[PDB]
Amino acid sequence: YSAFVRPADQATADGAAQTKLGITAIAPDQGVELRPNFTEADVITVIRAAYKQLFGNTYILESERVIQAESLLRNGSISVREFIRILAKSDLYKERFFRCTSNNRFIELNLKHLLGRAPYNQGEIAEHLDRYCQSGYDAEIDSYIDSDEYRRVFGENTVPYFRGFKYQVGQSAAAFERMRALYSGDAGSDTDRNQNGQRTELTSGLADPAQPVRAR
Amino acid sequence: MQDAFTKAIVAADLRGSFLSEQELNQLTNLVKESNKRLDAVNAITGNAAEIISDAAHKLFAEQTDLIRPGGNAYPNRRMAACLRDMEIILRYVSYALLAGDASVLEDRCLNGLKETYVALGTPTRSVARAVQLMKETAIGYVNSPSGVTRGDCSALVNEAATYFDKAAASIA
Amino acid sequence: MQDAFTKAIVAADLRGSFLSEQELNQLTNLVKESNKRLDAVNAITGNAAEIISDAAHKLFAEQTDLIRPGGNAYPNRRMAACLRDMEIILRYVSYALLAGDASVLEDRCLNGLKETYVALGTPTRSVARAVQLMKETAIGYVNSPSGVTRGDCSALVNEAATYFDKAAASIA
Amino acid sequence: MQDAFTKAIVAADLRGSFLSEQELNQLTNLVKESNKRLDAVNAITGNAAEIISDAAHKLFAEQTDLIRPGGNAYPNRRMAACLRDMEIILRYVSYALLAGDASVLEDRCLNGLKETYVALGTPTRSVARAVQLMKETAIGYVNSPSGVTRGDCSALVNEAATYFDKAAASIA
Amino acid sequence: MQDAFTKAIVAADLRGSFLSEQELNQLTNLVKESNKRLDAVNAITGNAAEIISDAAHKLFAEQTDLIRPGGNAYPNRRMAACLRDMEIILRYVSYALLAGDASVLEDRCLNGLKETYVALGTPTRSVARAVQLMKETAIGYVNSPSGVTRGDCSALVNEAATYFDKAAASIA
Amino acid sequence: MKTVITEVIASADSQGRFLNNTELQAANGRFQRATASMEAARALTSNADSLVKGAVQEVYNKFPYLTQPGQMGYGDTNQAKCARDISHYLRFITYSLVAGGTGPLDDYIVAGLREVNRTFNLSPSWYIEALKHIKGKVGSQLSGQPLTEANAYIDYCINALS
Amino acid sequence: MKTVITEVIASADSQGRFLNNTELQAANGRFQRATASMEAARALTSNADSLVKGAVQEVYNKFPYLTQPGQMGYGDTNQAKCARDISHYLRFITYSLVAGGTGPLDDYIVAGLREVNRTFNLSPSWYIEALKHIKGKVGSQLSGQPLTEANAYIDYCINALS
Amino acid sequence: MKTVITEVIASADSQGRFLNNTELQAANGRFQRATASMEAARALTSNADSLVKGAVQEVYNKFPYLTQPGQMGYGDTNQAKCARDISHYLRFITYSLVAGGTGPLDDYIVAGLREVNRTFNLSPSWYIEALKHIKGKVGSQLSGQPLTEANAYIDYCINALS
Ligand SMILES: *[C@H](C)[C@H]1/C(=C/c2[nH]c(/C=C3N=C(/C=C4\NC(=O)C(CC)=C4C)C(C)=C\3CCC(=O)O)c(CCC(=O)O)c2C)NC(=O)[C@@H]1C
Ligand SMILES: *[C@H](C)[C@H]1/C(=C/c2[nH]c(/C=C3N=C(/C=C4\NC(=O)C(CC)=C4C)C(C)=C\3CCC(=O)O)c(CCC(=O)O)c2C)NC(=O)[C@@H]1C
Ligand SMILES: *[C@H](C)[C@H]1/C(=C/c2[nH]c(/C=C3N=C(/C=C4\NC(=O)C(CC)=C4C)C(C)=C\3CCC(=O)O)c(CCC(=O)O)c2C)NC(=O)[C@@H]1C
Ligand SMILES: *[C@H](C)[C@H]1/C(=C/c2[nH]c(/C=C3N=C(/C=C4\NC(=O)C(CC)=C4C)C(C)=C\3CCC(=O)O)c(CCC(=O)O)c2C)NC(=O)[C@@H]1C
Ligand SMILES: *[C@H](C)[C@H]1/C(=C/c2[nH]c(/C=C3N=C(/C=C4\NC(=O)C(CC)=C4C)C(C)=C\3CCC(=O)O)c(CCC(=O)O)c2C)NC(=O)[C@@H]1C
Ligand SMILES: *[C@H](C)[C@H]1/C(=C/c2[nH]c(/C=C3N=C(/C=C4\NC(=O)C(CC)=C4C)C(C)=C\3CCC(=O)O)c(CCC(=O)O)c2C)NC(=O)[C@@H]1C
Numbered sequence A: 001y002s003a004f005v006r007p008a009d010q011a012t013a014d015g016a017a018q019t020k021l022g023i024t025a026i027a028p029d030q031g032v033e034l035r036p037n038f039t040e041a042d043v044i045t046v047i048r049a050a051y052k053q054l055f056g057n058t059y060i061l062e063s064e065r066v067i068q069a070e071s072l073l074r075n076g077s078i079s080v081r082e083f084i085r086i087l088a089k090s091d092l093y094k095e096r097f098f099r100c101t102s103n104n105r106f107i108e109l110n111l112k113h114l115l116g117r118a119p120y121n122q123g124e125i126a127e128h129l130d131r132y133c134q135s136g137y138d139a140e141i142d143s144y145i146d147s148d149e150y151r152r153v154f155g156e157n158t159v160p161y162f163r164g165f166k167y168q169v170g171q172s173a174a175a176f177e178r179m180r181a182l183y184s185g186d187a188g189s190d191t192d193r194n195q196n197g198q199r200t201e202l203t204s205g206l207a208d209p210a211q212p213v214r215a216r
Numbered sequence B, C, D, E: 001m002q003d004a005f006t007k008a009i010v011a012a013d014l015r016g017s018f019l020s021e022q023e024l025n026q027l028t029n030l031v032k033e034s035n036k037r038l039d040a041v042n043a044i045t046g047n048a049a050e051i052i053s054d055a056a057h058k059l060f061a062e063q064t065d066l067i068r069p070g071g072n073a074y075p076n077r078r079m080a081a082c083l084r085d086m087e088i089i090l091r092y093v094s095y096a097l098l099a100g101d102a103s104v105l106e107d108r109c110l111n112g113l114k115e116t117y118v119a120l121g122t123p124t125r126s127v128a129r130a131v132q133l134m135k136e137t138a139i140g141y142v143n144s145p146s147g148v149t150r151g152d153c154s155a156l157v158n159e160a161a162t163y164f165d166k167a168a169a170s171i172a
Numbered sequence F, G, H: 001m002k003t004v005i006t007e008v009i010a011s012a013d014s015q016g017r018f019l020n021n022t023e024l025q026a027a028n029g030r031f032q033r034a035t036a037s038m039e040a041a042r043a044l045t046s047n048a049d050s051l052v053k054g055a056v057q058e059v060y061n062k063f064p065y066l067t068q069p070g071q072m073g074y075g076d077t078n079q080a081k082c083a084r085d086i087s088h089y090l091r092f093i094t095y096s097l098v099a100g101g102t103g104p105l106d107d108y109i110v111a112g113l114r115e116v117n118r119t120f121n122l123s124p125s126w127y128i129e130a131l132k133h134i135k136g137k138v139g140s141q142l143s144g145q146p147l148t149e150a151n152a153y154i155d156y157c158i159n160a161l162s
């Protein structure tokens, strides 16, 4: 009955590991779900969130915000996944967050904005690249929200979340490594307007041979 | 997240021990100050809009270039950002002030901020300046309210300062 | 995005000035050429399929290995990609040609392209080659059309070239 | 993905040739062993829960600290993760074992695992240890089943080992 | 979507025929009016803000209850919507006017609008009223411009009216 | 359906913004062009038939074997179809000239072109010749901008077919 | 930045297709108009100053109290700013004429307009007057299409401000 | 690459579950069949050449005009290619038999088949004949299950080509 307990050596604790990565609560995510009866506030909070998750976390002006999509949420008749479709089909996202960056760049950033995951393999990135010319851009983004896993988790009536930076199923390697690259600090946000323009955080070089290394 | 209480807990945990009686007495006392603490926060929130407005005016009177073509605060678009930013920082600071801990501020608000600013080309120095400008105005209110029971808030005032300063530093 | 006009504006903005009369006269003249400019584009778009088809044939006659087992254009799947790619590049080039500016091409297409190719193991050299092959064929059409009012297109022809070349260079 | 068969194909492809008769005889014999191969897998999957449970016990008896306040397996939440992890690794290993190829394991499971562990501050060494602990237990079952026709499974046993080891190595 | 030209096409398609010469002459003349057509649109867009502002004032002077507690335009939140709505309708109308076809207006705006309004408890009546108020003001501008070459716009003016009216009707 | 006018409306609509100067400029372009376009259509519409005959014919010269028994070009039914089809292509082209956009072409002809052709084993090549032969004839009846327009659209199909 | 030329590229780009006839038609429009646009710009650029003076002034007549002490219109600094600002508006307008799109206006002036104005308590109204007064003057130096263009853009701001 | 074994792993993997009895049953199937599959491959591999000659040839009989000057079948280069290509098809088929899945076929031959063929104007038809002729010959050297397997795969391509 010694009940030797003891401080131990490492003394890492719960919190320290995540502060080291710098997630600061980005990896933990609390999903937000809409209800058929909802306060306008509850709709607002959803809009607030939706914007952030699909946008770079870039600043959104009132002018930038599309009121017609915001209208209809109060009404109903728009599924929240369909609301999120309206965004990105928006000129706002295409002209900014699409034009500047390379095809590869927006694919990774879509795959981030719409889903937490960074891209597990080179081939799937390539699958969307086949689409670029194969079909119209609108289809390809539509394909993401239409993809199964978008549906599987936060499928309907749910704001997308950066479920990345936790264990998700079938993550082919370097989930954390790629995500570490793709997420800057919580305050920090991908910027439509940036020096050196915008380049893929993840090395094109990799996506197969090695784990990425990026400034944090 | 974290705050004064939670923090002390965590520390205790790693030692592997129940909370020291001494340590309780830190928290016990901290409680007593609550009322003061609260009013402090209230004062900021109450004056928020103005604090900013004010600080800005002064910022731009000083660093004329920011508002000139080629500067960072020009044109409107940018200006807007700059205002928004100031606000945010403030917002956080407040949060911290309530919590009784820097953390919240450091993590959500300051983390990565410098690098962002760099990438944008925003001159970190000026940002820092603004933060201070805010600081002084804010304290102004914290320290001179109306209809509140008279007493000493210094302790809180200084802690407030520190938060502002951590901000200034990590941005700069 | 950007193009000739917008560009000149932007420059002027940072100086903080109204557009110089000299500068207007760049744009004034640019307008005059429009008609020519347009037809150029039209010629490319009209012949698109062919341009590619042609270039490819020649590419593969030269570098037999690409189509042999172990090469980069083998098997079908890969081949397809390679064709697709060429096309894309073309598409952009055209865009630029209309705009009167490289940007669009650089930003959407060329940026990072090299590195991609590297990571894949695609031989950058060969890609560049293809680009040129395309260039020559394309010019071929731009410069020898049918039913168009006869005049001098050189100015446009050269600018076209440059675009192709920026491509070639940054890939290579 | 890949596996023993597909692999041999791929090799043959790059040479540009039909499969060598010699090479067929690799696959022909591989087939013959199937039955053995299968049972091996079956044994692991059948005992899965146990394998882990066991390995853990031993892991924690050895490295007491992991389970002590401030250690990496403490508190519950962490513990859970650590268990989950072990399982996963196992799961993959199994997969490989069926395929008759490391690949699947290397790509989805191993690649960049090390780095993850590093970033978290999890001690890679301990993880590796666990992997081995698992290995031994697992083999235990593979090699001592009930109701199976008695014969030689060594060949498979060793290949199993190797998989475990690739794991151990790349984590470590 | 649809417009005057496309429409005529579609009709012709189902008959399975090339366009009748008669039918061409509808379109031929339609072209000629373009310039007029355009200016009309321009006038609306140019005065937009005003048109609305105006109509609103009058709407609320008439139906005072809408703005009183318990009414539909109260409180602010609602008011805002109501303004927004008016605008939208206008926006569409304009679109139509350019197209030379009701469709766009009907399809993307009007269809099911009634029912919505009903479900909400918005008084459809009042909405319709507003539409007209707008109509009159709008025509006001369309029909009395400055610095445009003087001529007869009636034809267009009436078509404009009709659009407004389709709106009024389907809402009502 | 994609015409100049429809698109600008669409784009305006998406953003949720009034038609401003930007779009009108564009529109102005169209309708200015129309005069030429319209002319071209009147010319094709009139000579339709003759163009069709000539084309169908051509194809057979180009691919003699088609007219042999057991082939596709053989037996009247097929010939009738062949005629019909080309008529269509033409028809649409006219449409597109008038509409001032590829729209009509895209939706009737282009979309799903491949699969149709695959499942019935129509060789794109054929159509192409038809078109080319046409283009050549058109290159007499028309001139200047009218001509240019005619070409653009004709080609657009060539490219879609190939 | 939104100009005719950029947009068609954008639209073409989105669909993933080459610039076909549709878009070119549009582009052509932009180019033909430019001649008028360009003229207008030359006229504004030249009279800039005089327009500015007149405007600033106007505002004060319209809102006398602004010039009283303790107000915003009072003390030279403010007047200077007021001048500067209007200059800007003008500057951009010219730009937009030349660029053949609202683009320049949107990005510099419009985006973030509200919040700026709110936080510094600038009343949109003022600017508006400035513009209107301007519009009136411009309505003398220019005529026909050149004029029309000038208006469009001037207004576009009025609408954005209000 | 799609083989029986890879798929079950994939499916197992997706769900995030261990390989249970269900999948193994499936795998077993693949292995039992292999004996027949393997046999077939040995037979094709041996007669390869002869099959190829016969096929190429056939195609020309079927489509005489190809061998005429100015055509695709004409001039040795093309003939060489034609040979090469068919070899490939065969090669892969063997592979697929051995791999016990369509995988090999899918990734080398099928994916991107259309566009390749379109851009170089290779008529699927041709290949098909090649295959058919082959199928007919194979229908002598083989028998029972070995045969059945051979067919399946050969066809699979016919269907993909058409
Ligand atoms: C104002 C005192 C100074 C200033 C501000 C300024 N900021 C930006 C741009 C960005 N600001 C941020 C910062 C944050 N991200 C967050 O989530 C938070 C709160 C947690 C902050 C504070 C980001 C990410 C951007 C990028 C936005 C985007 O890409 O659109 C600018 C504009 C620079 C730009 O090009 O975007 C400015 C002007 N800089 C100054 O000049 C002032 C001294
Ligand atoms: C400090 C910067 C200035 C100051 C503060 C001060 N406050 C009190 C006492 C109280 N303040 C509150 C306020 C709140 N309590 C709450 O629960 C909330 C949220 C609903 C608020 C805003 C309360 C309830 C008290 C108790 C009664 C009272 O008002 O006195 C004091 C008195 C000392 C104490 O420890 O409470 C003081 C000094 N007064 C100043 O002059 C400082 C500049
Ligand atoms: C053809 C001339 C040569 C060739 C091409 C080739 N490319 C790939 C693969 C890719 N190429 C790209 C291209 C782009 N990335 C971008 O961001 C843009 C601009 C917007 C483009 C056009 C990319 C992303 C890939 C990767 C995805 C994919 O597989 O398509 C390949 C395939 C590589 C492989 O090994 O599978 C090939 C073959 N290679 C040649 O042989 C020619 C010299
Ligand atoms: C240059 C590579 C070759 C060439 C071109 C060329 N074109 C013109 C003149 C015109 N071309 C057009 C064509 C269009 N204008 C449009 O708006 C559109 C899209 C709707 C097209 C397709 C037009 C209208 C003109 C003006 C009328 C005319 O055809 O004469 C010229 C003449 C120079 C000029 O117009 O300034 C030239 C030289 N011709 C060559 O010789 C080159 C090989
Ligand atoms: C157990 C033997 C040792 C140990 C491990 C450990 N891991 C975590 C947390 C995570 N582990 C992973 C790893 C994976 N990502 C993948 O892609 C795969 C398969 C290819 C694995 C196995 C991940 C993603 C996490 C992070 C998120 C999460 O916790 O779910 C922990 C918890 C530590 C933490 O704070 O995250 C631990 C404890 N540590 C020990 O105690 C053992 C010696
Ligand atoms: C090796 C570690 C152990 C072992 C295995 C062993 N198994 C057999 C033979 C068979 N085992 C099975 C099992 C399966 N076949 C299937 O189709 C499936 C999936 C549903 C399973 C699980 C079967 C059917 C056979 C054939 C009949 C039999 O049971 O013997 C052998 C015999 C040799 C051989 O298969 O070549 C052996 C050696 N024996 C050991 O020494 C370990 C216990």
Ligand SMILES: *[C@H](C)[C@H]1/C(=C/c2[nH]c(/C=C3N=C(/C=C4\NC(=O)C(CC)=C4C)C(C)=C\3CCC(=O)O)c(CCC(=O)O)c2C)NC(=O)[C@@H]1C
Pocket (backbone or CB within 6 Å): A068, A071, A072, A074, A075, E066, E072, E073, E078, E079, E081, E082, E083, E085, E086, E088, E089, E108, E109, E113, E116, E120, E122, E123, E126, E127, E130
């Ligand atoms: C104003 C003239 C009258 C009025 C309008 C009013 N509308 C709502 C709410 C909505 N109005 C619409 C209209 C549209 N939304 C669209 O997107 C379209 C076209 C695509 C239309 C025409 C919609 C959809 C709504 C529903 C949700 C919303 O908040 O807008 C209200 C407020 C309803 C509420 O209870 O929240 C009002 C007041 N009603 C009046 O009082 C005026 C006479």
Ligand SMILES: *[C@H](C)[C@H]1/C(=C/c2[nH]c(/C=C3N=C(/C=C4\NC(=O)C(CC)=C4C)C(C)=C\3CCC(=O)O)c(CCC(=O)O)c2C)NC(=O)[C@@H]1C
Pocket (backbone or CB within 6 Å): E032, E033, E035, E036, E038, E039, E040, E042, E142, E143, E144, E145, E148, E149, E150, E151, E152, E153, E156, F024, F025, F028, G033, G144, G145, G148
């Ligand atoms: C009708 C409601 C009122 C009116 C219109 C009117 N306009 C014209 C002639 C023109 N209007 C324009 C204007 C434009 N053309 C464009 O392409 C654009 C967008 C870029 C605009 C804004 C043009 C160019 C013309 C041609 C001649 C001119 O210099 O105006 C007329 C005259 C008839 C005609 O079609 O030529 C009329 C009547 N003016 C009125 O009197 C009505 C109140």
Ligand SMILES: *[C@H](C)[C@H]1/C(=C/c2[nH]c(/C=C3N=C(/C=C4\NC(=O)C(CC)=C4C)C(C)=C\3CCC(=O)O)c(CCC(=O)O)c2C)NC(=O)[C@@H]1C
Pocket (backbone or CB within 6 Å): F059, F066, F072, F073, F074, F078, F079, F081, F082, F083, F085, F088, F108, F109, F116, F120, F122, F126, F127, F130
């Ligand atoms: C002419 C060069 C050759 C030819 C043509 C031919 N076509 C068919 C069958 C079809 N043709 C079409 C084409 C269209 N129908 C449409 O609706 C459109 C879009 C507006 C097109 C382009 C279609 C759909 C068919 C399918 C069945 C049908 O006839 O409608 C055939 C018959 C093939 C068969 O076996 O059914 C033929 C022969 N005829 C010749 O002689 C030339 C070789």
Ligand SMILES: *[C@H](C)[C@H]1/C(=C/c2[nH]c(/C=C3N=C(/C=C4\NC(=O)C(CC)=C4C)C(C)=C\3CCC(=O)O)c(CCC(=O)O)c2C)NC(=O)[C@@H]1C
Pocket (backbone or CB within 6 Å): B057, B060, B061, B067, B073, B074, B075, B076, B079, G059, G066, G072, G073, G074, G078, G079, G081, G082, G083, G085, G088, G108, G109, G116, G120, G122, G126, G127
């Ligand atoms: C004129 C009608 C009134 C007036 C003007 C005035 N303006 C400011 C301050 C600002 N004005 C602007 C405007 C711009 N800056 C830009 O970058 C752009 C876009 C290109 C514009 C339109 C800005 C940004 C400011 C704020 C920052 C600054 O200090 O300039 C003021 C001063 C407000 C203050 O309290 O400091 C004034 C007074 N002056 C008058 O007398 C009229 C009432």
Ligand SMILES: *[C@H](C)[C@H]1/C(=C/c2[nH]c(/C=C3N=C(/C=C4\NC(=O)C(CC)=C4C)C(C)=C\3CCC(=O)O)c(CCC(=O)O)c2C)NC(=O)[C@@H]1C
Pocket (backbone or CB within 6 Å): C057, C060, C067, C074, C075, C076, C079, H059, H066, H072, H073, H074, H078, H079, H081, H082, H083, H085, H088, H108, H109, H116, H120, H122, H126, H127
């Ligand atoms: C035989 C029935 C006919 C024939 C064929 C022929 N093919 C080409 C060109 C190509 N054919 C293919 C086919 C493949 N190449 C591959 O790598 C694969 C997958 C492993 C296949 C099935 C391809 C890709 C090409 C294009 C590039 C190349 O040069 O191979 C030609 C030449 C046509 C040209 O313009 O290059 C020919 C003639 N030859 C005949 O005589 C028959 C009619």
